Amino acid sequence: AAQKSFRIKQKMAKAKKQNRPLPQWIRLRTNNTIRYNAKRRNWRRTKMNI
Amino acid sequence: GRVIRNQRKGAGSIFTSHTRLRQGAAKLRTLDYAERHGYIRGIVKQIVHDSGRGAPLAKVVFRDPYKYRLREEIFIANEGVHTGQFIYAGKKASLNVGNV
Amino acid sequence: GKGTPSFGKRHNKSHTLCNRCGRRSFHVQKKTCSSCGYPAAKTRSYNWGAKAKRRHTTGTGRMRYLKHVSRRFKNGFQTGSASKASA
Amino acid sequence: AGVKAYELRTKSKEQLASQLVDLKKELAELKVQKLSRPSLPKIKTVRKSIACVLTVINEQQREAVRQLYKGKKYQPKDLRAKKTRALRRALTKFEASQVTEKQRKKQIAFPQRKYAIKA
Amino acid sequence: VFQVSMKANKYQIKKAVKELYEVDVLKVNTLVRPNGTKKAYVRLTADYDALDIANRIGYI
RNA sequence: AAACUUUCAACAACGGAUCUCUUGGUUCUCGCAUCGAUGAAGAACGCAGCGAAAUGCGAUACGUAAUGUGAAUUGCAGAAUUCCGUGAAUCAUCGAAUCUUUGAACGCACAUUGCGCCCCUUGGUAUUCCAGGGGGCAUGCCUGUUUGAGCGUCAUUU
RNA sequence: CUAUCUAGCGAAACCACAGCCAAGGGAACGGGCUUGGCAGAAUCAGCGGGGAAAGAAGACCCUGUUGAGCUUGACUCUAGU
RNA sequence: GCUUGUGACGGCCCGUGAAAAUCCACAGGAAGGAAUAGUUUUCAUGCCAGGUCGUACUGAUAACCGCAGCAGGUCUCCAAG
RNA sequence: CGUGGAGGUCAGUGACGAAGCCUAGACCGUAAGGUCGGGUCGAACGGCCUCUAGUGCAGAUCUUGGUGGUAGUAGCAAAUAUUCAAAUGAGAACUUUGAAGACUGAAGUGGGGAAAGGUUCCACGUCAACAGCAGUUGGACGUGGGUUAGUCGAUCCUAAGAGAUGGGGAAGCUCCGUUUCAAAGGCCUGAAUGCAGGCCACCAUCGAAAGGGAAUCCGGUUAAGAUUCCGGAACCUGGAUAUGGAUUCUUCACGGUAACGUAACUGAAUGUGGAGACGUCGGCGCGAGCCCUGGGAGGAGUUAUCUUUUCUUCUUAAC
RNA sequence: GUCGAAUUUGGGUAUAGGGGCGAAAGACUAAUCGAACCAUCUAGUAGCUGGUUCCUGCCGAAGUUUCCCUCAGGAUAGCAG
RNA sequence: AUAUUGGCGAGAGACCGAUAGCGAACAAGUACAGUGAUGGAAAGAUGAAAAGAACUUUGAAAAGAGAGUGAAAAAGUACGU
RNA sequence: UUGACCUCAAAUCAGGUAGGAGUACCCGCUGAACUUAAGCAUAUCAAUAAGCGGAGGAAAAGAAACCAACCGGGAUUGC
C-alpha cells in the first residue's frame, strides 16, 4: 500500500508468483486429475487480507 | 440495574486528571539541616500560571547545601511575592510575606 | 447511516499478521494474537474449541523432526554407519 | 554424471576446496547459457555434485574434530548421543545399578532359588 | 544488471562483483523486484567496457 | 380448418435418480511405548530443465551421504543409459550430514527483514573509524569456581 | 423523461387445484356444492371491484404451573460494611 | 487584486496555549604549553566513504469500504479571465 | 406384500447379456404386489427355508438437489449530447484517427498524495467467459517488461500510552508495579593491558511514513522509474588529515569610548544559559509567485469592410 | 438548521458485556443492544403447534366417575382389543 | 493383574456405499465468509486400450457435414446406466 | 597488621537442569447452569461441562494407626 512494510511486499510477491494458469503439460501426466488451477486469485474478486 | 455514574469514576479511564501542561507538583523545599536549624535564601525566579489551577505558582531557586549546583523549587505564590525577591526559609528566618 | 455509509470508513486493521501462527490475528493495539496467543508462552487452545484444535494440532504441520522419530525408535536409535555386504 | 562419493573421500581438503570453486564457476556459467537456450537439464548434475563435494568436506572436518575430542569427558553437543531428550537424561546403567550395602548382602544371603516339584 | 542474493548488501555485491568478473565498480543501486528477488545495477568505471565484459560472460 | 391448449407415443432436450462399481469412512479386537533449550509442535518464505497446487525438501532446497536393490524415470525434453555394474531409480532402507526466516525461542526489538556489545580473522594507512568472514552476550534454579560485602562475628595485633 | 412499439439483455413476488354470475343452504359473506342465468378460438393497452390478494407461525387479548428489562420492608440470599 | 511568507503590533481567557532526542554557548581553571623554537584541525585548501527496507499505479459515479464497474461512505496540497 | 444385509438350499440365472431403466403391450392376485414380451442396456443377480434391521412417504412454512408457470414479462428512463467521415475488422451506434457539436468551468470531470488495494502500471498477443445493448475495446484473458536514493520517507527521539526487571499478590492461567522497602553502572585517562587514577550515576524497552529531525538542486532521459537514473552543480554526517594562514620572546589574537567588529585565536572536572519549543484572533508594512499591463524582437489567426489588430515565445534552480 | 466555536475532522491512544460509554434517547458499544459477537454445557425442557412411510381381514370406542396449584394436562373407574 | 474417542504397527465386521459413511473416497479443514474468536462447503465412474476422431468440405470462428477409431460414439474428455 | 568463620552477593564463572507441544487414559485444583422435582429455594443434574497446575506407558494405590468381633482374616488394583 504505497510505502509498504517489507513483509507485506514479500507476502505480495508470493501470491503474485502463484497466480498463473496451469502449466499445459500437467494434463498429459499419467493418472492426472487436475484440469485447471482451482486456487487462482484476482484483485477485483477476492481480497488477500494482507 | 446498571453501574451508576459515580461508581465508574474510581476506575480511572475517562475520569483521570488532565495533567499534560501543568508545572511540576507544588511542594515546599525538603525539610533538612538548613531549615531545621538556620534558614536559607533563594530568589523567586518567576511566578507563572499552572493549568487547571487558579493559584499562580512561584519558582524559587536555591543553592544546594551539599553540592555545587542550583536547585529549583515550585512554591504557590502568596500574593505579594514577586519575581526577584529573596525568600528566606527556616526556623531562624524572619517574619515576612513569602518566607516559610 | 449505521449501514452502507458507515462501512465506507473502514480502512484501519485491528489485527496484522501474527509472527507465530501466520494468521492475521495479531491485535495491533492489544499486541496479542487472537487465535494463537502470541506472545504468551503457551499456544492458545480451548476444549469447547475442538474444531479449532484439530486445525492447529500436530500433523497439520510439517512434522519436520517428530515424523522421523518412530523409525529411529523402530531400530534402537542406531549409532554409526552401515557395514555394507563386503566380500 | 558429476561427482562420486567414494572418489572424493580420497582427495585432500585443499583439493576439494578447489574442486568446489570450479564447480561454482561452471554452475555459474551454466545459469548464463541456461537463459539463452530452450532449457538446460544438464545443470542439475553439477548443483547436486556441489552438495556431494560439500557433504564430503563436512564428513572430513567433522570426523577430524571427532578425533581431537576422542576419549575426553566433554565433547561438543553437536557430536553427542542425540537419541531422545527424555532418554539421554535417564539414569546411566551404572547409576541404576547401585544398591545399598544393606541390600547387596541381602541379595547374596538369600537370592532367588531355582527349584521344581516332582510327583 | 545482476540478480543478487536477497541477503547481500551493496558492499558484498561490489566486493563479489569485482572478485568474480575482475572489474572496477563505480556505484551500485539495488532494488527488489516484484517477485521477491534483488536486482543490482552495477556500473563499471571508465576503465572498462560493460558490453565487452558482458559477452565475456557470454550473453549479448 | 389452423393457431393455441391438453393427453398419449417416438426421437431429441433438461437434469443426475436408479443399477453396478469403492485406494474412503465406521466400529471391534491385538501388539508396542518414542516430542522438546542436541531448538519440538506450529508458522513464514523459498527450493524442479520446463509447477500453480497437493506431496517432499531447505541456499548441499521434489534433495547430499550411507545401506539394499539390480535397470530404469516417462508429460516432453535431457541425458552419459556410464547394465557382468561402487550401478538405473519420483525404488526400498536409513545409522551420516545439510536444515533459510521463525517459533517455549535465548543480546534488544518486531505492524521495522530495526538496533547494541564482546571475541577471532581478511581487506581499506588503521589499537581507535568503515567494511567482508567466523564464533558469541536470555531467565529461574542446583553443584562447583573465582572475586567481593557486612563492628553478624572469632582470632591475631605489634 | 417514462409508459407504449422494436433490436438486444432479462429478473422477482406468488402459486392446493383453479379462475363468469344470482340465489340457496353451508363452519351463520362460495371459483367449485344445489337450482337458475348462461356459454365461442387467439389476444393488446389500461384499471384498481374482488381473488375475505401479497408481505410475517397476531404485538392486541387469553392461556402456559414459558421468559426477560425493571421496582419494592415481596420469598431467599449477597459483595461491601 | 489573489495565494502566501515575513516584519512590526493590538486584543482574548476561572482556557495563558507538548515532550524528548539533538546542537551550540557561557562561568570555571584541571591541564599542556616557545625560540633556532612549539602552538592551535571552530580559518582556508586538499583525501576516502556513507549500509538496510519502501519507491510501480488507482486514490474513486470503475482500482478502498458498502456481496457489484453500487447516484452511498472515506483525511489532505496547488487553484486562470 | 415389499426393501438392505445374514445362515442354508436350488450343483438356481447370466457377456449367447446380470442389474437398472422405458414401454395408452400380456397374464396372476380384493389388495399390497408378482410374472412375461419389446426396447435400451452393460456384470452382476434371483426362488424357497430361516436370521436380522439405519426396512416402505404426499405432506412436517420438512432436508438437499434439480425444474416450472409467472415471462420474453417488471425492467435496462438521475448525473444537459451527440453528429459526419475515414481506418481497422468476417462483423463497428460503441475501437482508433480526423472533423464538427458540447461539458466539467479550477471548492474541476484538472495536477499529486494519506489509509486502503496489490500489479490494477506498461507493452505484445487476444474475445470463450466478465464489462445486466455491444464489442475489433477493457481495470478482462494470455505472455512478458517494470519500482535504482548518503540528501524523500522509514530507521532516531519522545507523546497519550504500553511494558520487562528486585519485588508483592493469586490454586493457577496470571495480577499489581516502572522507580519503586533492590548491593540495579559506563564513561574518559595514563600505567597492549591489568592494575593505580579519577569524576558521574534514579533508572530496560515499545509507542508518530501528519509531532521533533543532519544534509540536493536544476536540465535531460522510459513503452512503463526517477528530488533515486544520466549530465552538471552542491551539501551533510563520518573518518582520515597535509599544506597554507593565524598566534607566542609580553606565551594562549589584535581593534573600537562603547553597542560590537576580525578568515583563526588553548580550556578538563563541574555548573549553567540558549536554540529543539509550540494558543487564538484582528488589522498595518514589506517580499515572493499568480493576476493585470506598455515598449520591442519573433511565430500564429482574421482581414468584403474595420482594427499601429487577436493569440502566443521573452525563462532562471538549490548552492 | 448551523457555519469562528460546547466548531468540523485524520491518526495515535484509553474504557469490554450486568461491562463500558452516555449534554440521558434505554441511546451507543462493527447493518447486532431493555445486556454484544463466538464456541461449548446442548439433541437445554416443552401439559404446546406441526409431521409420523405397505395391503387386506375381524372386533371396536370416548368426551363420563373420583382425586389432583386439577380446568389445553395426569392418576382413576368405565367403554375397547 | 487395571485404565485408555491420543501416538505407533497390525488383524477383522450380519457397519456405510458418494444427499450414505468422518466435515473431507477428490490440490479438505481445502475454496469461500468474518476485524476477530470462529464459520466451513461443493465435488468419485469415457474405454480393454486414447485407438482422444488423420483427411475432405461449408464456416470469420465456435462448430456443422462427410469420413475415420472402437466390441459399442445408442461410450466423443458436456464422457457408464 | 595478618588468617579464618557465619551470612550474603557478583561473573558471557565450570557442568547442568526447567519452560513448550500432546492430552484417549492418569494425579490434583477450580467449578457451573440447562435439567428433574409436572411450580420452586434444599435437593437433582454433578462432587459433571467449561477454566487451572503435574505425569507416565500406564498413572495412581500398596506392605495396614487395615478388615473384622470369626475357630477370625492380613499390602494394593481390577472382575
Ligand SMILES: NC[C@@H]1O[C@H](O[C@H]2[C@@H](O)[C@H](O[C@@H]3[C@@H](O)[C@H](N)C[C@H](N)[C@H]3O[C@H]3O[C@H](CO)[C@@H](O)[C@H](O)[C@H]3N)O[C@@H]2CO)[C@H](N)[C@@H](O)[C@@H]1O
Ligand atoms: N508542563 C510543562 C512545563 O514546562 C516548563 O518549562 C518552561 C520553560 O522552560 C519552557 O520555555 C521554553 C524553552 O524551554 C524553549 N527552549 C524556548 C521557548 N521559547 C520557551 O517557551 C516559553 O517561553 C517563551 C518565551 O518567554 C514563550 O513565548 C512560550 O509561550 C513559553 N512556553 O516553557 C515552559 C514555560 O512556558 C518546565 N520544563 C516544567 O515545569 C514543565 O515541563
Ligand SMILES: NC[C@@H]1O[C@H](O[C@H]2[C@@H](O)[C@H](O[C@@H]3[C@@H](O)[C@H](N)C[C@H](N)[C@H]3O[C@H]3O[C@H](CO)[C@@H](O)[C@H](O)[C@H]3N)O[C@@H]2CO)[C@H](N)[C@@H](O)[C@@H]1O
Ligand atoms: N490471509 C491470512 C489469514 O488467513 C486466514 O485463513 C487461512 C487459513 O484457513 C489457511 O491458511 C493455512 C493455515 O491455516 C495453516 N496453519 C498453514 C497453511 N500453510 C496455510 O495455508 C494458506 O497459505 C498459503 C500460502 O500463503 C496460501 O496459498 C493459502 O492462503 C493457504 N493454503 O488459508 C487461509 C487464507 O486466507 C483467514 N482467512 C484470515 O485470518 C486471514 O486472511
Ligand SMILES: NC[C@@H]1O[C@H](O[C@H]2[C@@H](O)[C@H](O[C@@H]3[C@@H](O)[C@H](N)C[C@H](N)[C@H]3O[C@H]3O[C@H](CO)[C@@H](O)[C@H](O)[C@H]3N)O[C@@H]2CO)[C@H](N)[C@@H](O)[C@@H]1O
Ligand atoms: N545466547 C543463547 C545461546 O544461543 C546459542 O545460539 C547462537 C547461534 O546459534 C544463534 O544464531 C541465530 C540463529 O539461531 C538464527 N536461526 C539465525 C540468526 N541470524 C542467529 O541470530 C544471532 O545473530 C543475530 C544477528 O542478527 C542476532 O540478531 C540474534 O540475536 C542472535 N541469536 O544465536 C546465538 C548467538 O547469538 C545457542 N542456541 C544456545 O547455546 C543458547 O540459546
Ligand SMILES: NC[C@@H]1O[C@H](O[C@H]2[C@@H](O)[C@H](O[C@@H]3[C@@H](O)[C@H](N)C[C@H](N)[C@H]3O[C@H]3O[C@H](CO)[C@@H](O)[C@H](O)[C@H]3N)O[C@@H]2CO)[C@H](N)[C@@H](O)[C@@H]1O
Ligand atoms: N514577542 C516580541 C515581538 O514578537 C512579534 O511577533 C510575535 C507575534 O506576531 C506573535 O505573538 C503573539 C502576540 O501577537 C499576541 N498578542 C500574544 C501571543 N501570546 C503571542 O504569541 C506568542 O506567545 C505565545 C505565548 O503567549 C506562544 O505560545 C506563541 O507561540 C507565540 N507566537 O508571535 C510572534 C512571536 O512571539 C514580532 N516578532 C516583534 O514585534 C517582537 O519580536
Ligand SMILES: NC[C@@H]1O[C@H](O[C@H]2[C@@H](O)[C@H](O[C@@H]3[C@@H](O)[C@H](N)C[C@H](N)[C@H]3O[C@H]3O[C@H](CO)[C@@H](O)[C@H](O)[C@H]3N)O[C@@H]2CO)[C@H](N)[C@@H](O)[C@@H]1O
Ligand atoms: N502575457 C505576457 C505579456 O505579453 C505581452 O506581450 C505583448 C508584446 O510582446 C507585444 O506588443 C506589440 C508591440 O510591441 C508592437 N509594436 C505592436 C503589437 N500590436 C503589440 O502587441 C499588442 O497586442 C494587442 C494589439 O494587437 C494589444 O492588445 C496589446 O496590448 C499590445 N501589446 O504583443 C503582445 C500582446 O500582448 C507583453 N510582453 C507583457 O505584458 C507580457 O510579456
Ligand SMILES: NC[C@@H]1O[C@H](O[C@H]2[C@@H](O)[C@H](O[C@@H]3[C@@H](O)[C@H](N)C[C@H](N)[C@H]3O[C@H]3O[C@H](CO)[C@@H](O)[C@H](O)[C@H]3N)O[C@@H]2CO)[C@H](N)[C@@H](O)[C@@H]1O
Ligand atoms: N474439421 C477438420 C478437423 O476436425 C477435427 O475435429 C474432428 C472431431 O474432433 C470432431 O468431432 C465432433 C465433435 O467435436 C463434436 N462434439 C460433435 C461430434 N461428436 C463430432 O462430429 C464429427 O464426427 C461426426 C460423427 O462421425 C461426423 O458426422 C461429423 O462430420 C464430425 N464433425 O469432428 C472433426 C472431424 O470431422 C478438429 N476440430 C480439427 O483438426 C479440424 O477442425
Ligand SMILES: [Mg+2]
Ligand atoms: Mg481436482
Ligand SMILES: [Mg+2]
Ligand atoms: Mg480468505
Ligand SMILES: [Mg+2]
Ligand atoms: Mg449492574
Ligand SMILES: [Mg+2]
Ligand atoms: Mg494523570
Ligand SMILES: [Mg+2]
Ligand atoms: Mg458488512
Ligand SMILES: [Mg+2]
Ligand atoms: Mg492505519
Ligand SMILES: [Mg+2]
Ligand atoms: Mg482498536
Ligand SMILES: [Mg+2]
Ligand atoms: Mg491488557
Ligand SMILES: [Mg+2]
Ligand atoms: Mg516472548
Ligand SMILES: [Mg+2]
Ligand atoms: Mg485427532
